[PDB]
Amino acid sequence: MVLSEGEWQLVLHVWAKVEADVAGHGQDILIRLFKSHPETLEKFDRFKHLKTEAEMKASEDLKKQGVTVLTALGAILKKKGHHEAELKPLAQSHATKHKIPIKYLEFISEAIIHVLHSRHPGNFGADAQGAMNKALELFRKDIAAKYKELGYQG
Ligand code: HEM
Numbered sequence: 001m002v003l004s005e006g007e008w009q010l011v012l013h014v015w016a017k018v019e020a021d022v023a024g025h026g027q028d029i030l031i032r033l034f035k036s037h038p039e040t041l042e043k044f045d046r047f048k049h050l051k052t053e054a055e056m057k058a059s060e061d062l063k064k065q066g067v068t069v070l071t072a073l074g075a076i077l078k079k080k081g082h083h084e085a086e087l088k089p090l091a092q093s094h095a096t097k098h099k100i101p102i103k104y105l106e107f108i109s110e111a112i113i114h115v116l117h118s119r120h121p122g123n124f125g126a127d128a129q130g131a132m133n134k135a136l137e138l139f140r141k142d143i144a145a146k147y148k149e150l151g152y153q154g
Pocket residue numbers: 040041043044045046068069070072073089090093094098100104105108
């Protein structure tokens with residue numbers, strides 16, 4: 001697929017708001033993912049023992065992870081579709097070491113769209129959400145195709 005420049009602008013306009021607070025958004029998104037799909041927490045050995053949302057909000061490790069996830073995702077979105085290089089290493093570790101099914105990437109995409117919608121209503125109307133969804137589907141589709149080349153899942 002191919003987003004138009006206008007769609008990319010809507011995606012990078014709300015992303016610029018997220019970058020004002022990367023660690024806070026990172027927490028909100030991972031906690032939303034873990035509350036919505038608790039099985040995903042099990043993939044994080046460093047903090048899968050966390051039992052509540054308050055323990056999650058106080059975990060430094062979870063917050064660092066969120067910053068790591070959003071910084072790598074922001075670098076991919078800023079490429080506007082030319083992200084082959086950025087995707088390689090990422091697909092190799094998620095397919096061979098961590099073992100993250102495409103279904104989990106769909107879950108966190110959902111969590112991202114939920115948090116932006118809450119925190120950025122004015123910059124996240126229907127057209128901006130449609131563009132963000134399009135950009136995340138593009139990211140999942142290219143990662144799924146790399147997973148297949150690397151020998152993992154479908
Ligand atoms: C927006 C999508 C995501 C991005 C951009 C992303 C990015 C990253 C990056 C940059 C790292 C560190 C470098 C590396 O290990 O590759 C990482 C590590 C990891 N990711 Fe992802 N990730 C995403 C989704 C997920 C999801 C949905 C899960 C699990 C349910 C996941 C599980 C992990 C785990 C287990 C690690 C290792 C953490 C540690 O060091 O113990 N990732 N991810």
